[PDB]
């Protein structure tokens, strides 16, 4: 139902990696990665852009040469999610501010003009009989 | 009063943990969290992201290893708050932009149209009864 | 002419500021501070939030208890500034694609339905003095 | 045809910067941009704004003064380019979301309007037609 269904998504890269994370790098840097716990809040720092590469990642990637990959990527991923949770918030908030509360008036303002409209019709029809019973009555 | 209200949410928030921030940290992080004021300051530069993890958070959590809630959660409520008004900005951004002026730009588009609807109908009744009378008249 | 108008702003706060901070610290931290270029660049990472607080504030609150002021001043002003070439550009672009399109698109559709509905007024005229004429001869 | 436009000049702003850095600063600084791997993951940390300034362009300024125009040009550049993919992103999406159908169901209630409008020209005529006959058949 809208955005929450990208806000589960986030919730399960995240995890995925906090896992993918105290997998590969636990043993060697437990700080940061040796509990699952212990991963996530490395992770939330790391989506935070909070030190990710001097603090957390290079001194990593040292230990381990391709660990970049997965570093960048969560990067990368976690932040094109984000960015769209926060799109998607965007939308679904002017959608209230504005969209739904005027799509209403232009729907129901045009109710009234066609009802207008249709007022109209009903006595041009009347009248278009009246004038011809003139040239019947006749 | 719209936004400011929202504004006013995240003065308290950050009331609410710089207290919350000293009642618990200054006699260990003194320097972070000694005072009221103190306190505040460390709050703003966390709430800024900057160095919040391994330059604040991190040695703090050595000291009370529970307190990454304190972290976390300001950050999120923090964050999620700030976040209601960089969108009610771009709300009441785009009021000015267009809506208020567009807004009031089909009102008045309609009001001129209704009225020709009016004065489009007046005349039909008119003519009616012109041939109404036309039709007693000459029964 | 819009957007280039904040940005006009933005840069003349920097100049405020950078000076501001080579008269205020320039003595003390002339690393940073010494000349007004120095500044320049400083209050750039500090624009960014690079390492503002604990590698560069902090340090000079150590020597000045109320530089803080200056500080969160700053990225207080030059945030709301920036987030409104953001909003700027946004509107504008907006503005761009779709706005100036329509805007105009349905100001089009109601010159034709008020023509249309124009001359529907002159045929219940002339309809409606026909019958006058034939009333009175009658 | 888009988006992926934009996000192959960053694609490429990025390769050009890297190069340029590695040939600049590989004798100097390499570990950060001893390679042009090295280069590339080192611009990706600047681009984040993690650190670029204490840990890594500030180091560079001090071994090559005019470092800094590398620096700032790189954010500047890189983050407007970014902004753009975010903005055109932004408005693709409410396109889709909402500018899609307001302006094709306006399309459409205006179509249903000049029918009704186009009705009764026609009735109006209609009984010109008639009251145009009382008056021959006199
Ligand atoms: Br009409």
Redesign the interface.
Known sequence: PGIAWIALLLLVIFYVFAVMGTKLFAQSFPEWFGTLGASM?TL??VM????????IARPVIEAYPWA?IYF?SF?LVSSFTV?NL??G???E???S???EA??AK??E??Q???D??????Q??????S??????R??
Chains 1, 3, 4 share one sequence.
């Open positions: 809040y939330f720092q935070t852009l909070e030190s990710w590469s001097m603090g970049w960048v990067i960015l926060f799109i918030i965007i939308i908030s002017m959608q501010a504005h969209w005027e799509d232009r729907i303002q045009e009234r003009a066609h207008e409209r249709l007022e109209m019709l006595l041009i029809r009347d009248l278009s009246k004038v011809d019973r003139l040239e009555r006749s």
